[PDB]
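Researcher: I'm comparing several assemblies side by side, and this is the next one on my list. It has 155 residues spread over two chains. Same procedure as the others: predict the full complex and return the structure.
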Amino acid sequence: PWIMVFLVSMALLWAIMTMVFFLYQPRSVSSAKGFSDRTVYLNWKW
Amino acid sequence: ASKRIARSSIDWAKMAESVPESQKAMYNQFKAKSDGYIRKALSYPEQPSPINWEHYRKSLTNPAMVDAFKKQYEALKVPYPEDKVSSQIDAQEAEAKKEITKFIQESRG
């Protein structure tokens, strides 16, 4: 039964591949440093 | 004749704290530009130099010309000239107030 063994192995390979795809660590490294560079200042009527 | 003698000067300290320094470096030009007109305001105070007319009356043989000069000097007393672009400053003042209100509500948001 090579066909059934091949299908299980390929289905396993797909299932391992999907598990690897979500295996990660999300990070939030976007602080408010750019907000400190948006100092809106009024033009003075010289 | 009135309004602004050399004693008048606005609070430069609060104004200097308000401006973002080199971002509004024209204020550094504006203060020195206004300071230069203070140098002109340093000279020529309100009253001129007094002149002892009696010394020239006695020294001159005929003091009738000195009396005529003194009478014409007292008659010719010209007052201050007219303000020119005060309305333009007033118009920009109203425009500044609108920009003040617009910037205030946006900053509040």
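Model: For your comparison table: The interface with chain A takes residues 19-20, 23-24, 26-27, 30, 92, 95-96, 99, 103, 106-107 of chain B (CB under 8 Å).
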